[PDB]
Amino acid sequence: IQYVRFLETALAVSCVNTEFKDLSRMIDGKIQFRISV
Amino acid sequence: EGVENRPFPYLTVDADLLSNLRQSAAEGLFHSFDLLVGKDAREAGI
Q1: Considering only CA atoms, which of B19, B33, B24 is closest in space to residue A31?
Q2: Which of B1, B5, B17 to mutate to test the interface with A (most CBs of A within 10 A)?
Q3: Residues 6 or more apart from B10 whose CB is under 8 A from it?
Q4: Which branch of life, at top level (chain B)?
């Protein structure tokens, strides 16, 4: 058995991992960008 | 679309998002987007 964590590896440099302890309740996520050109 | 146009405290980051932007939105890379030209570029009313 190789005890490997998602943080112990190098793939997490691509993903900012934040622990949300209630994710079954989120129906949907959203984010708004406003680019002024 | 699903875009909300209500005003917001738009947090300002320093990354230049707009590398080949208007060609991308006229091609529709984004799922859902709103082109606001001129008078509608303000904060809408509460």
Answers
A1: B33
A2: B17
A3: A34
A4: Viruses
| Cα–Cα distances in angstroms (integers) from residue B15 to residues A23, A36, B11, B19, B24, in the given order | 29, 13, 12, 10, 17
Asked whether the CA dihedral A17, A18, A22, A28 is positive or negative, the reply is negative
Q: What is the dihedral of CA B16, B29, A26, B8, to 10 degrees?
A: 40
Please indicate whether, in this complex, the C-beta atoms of A35 and B21 are within 8 angstroms of each other: yes
The CA radius of gyration of chain A, in Å to the nearest whole number, is 16
> Is there a contact between A32 and B8 if contact means CB atoms under 8 Å apart?
yes
B-chain residue closest to A29, CA distance: B2
Documented resolution in Å: 4.2
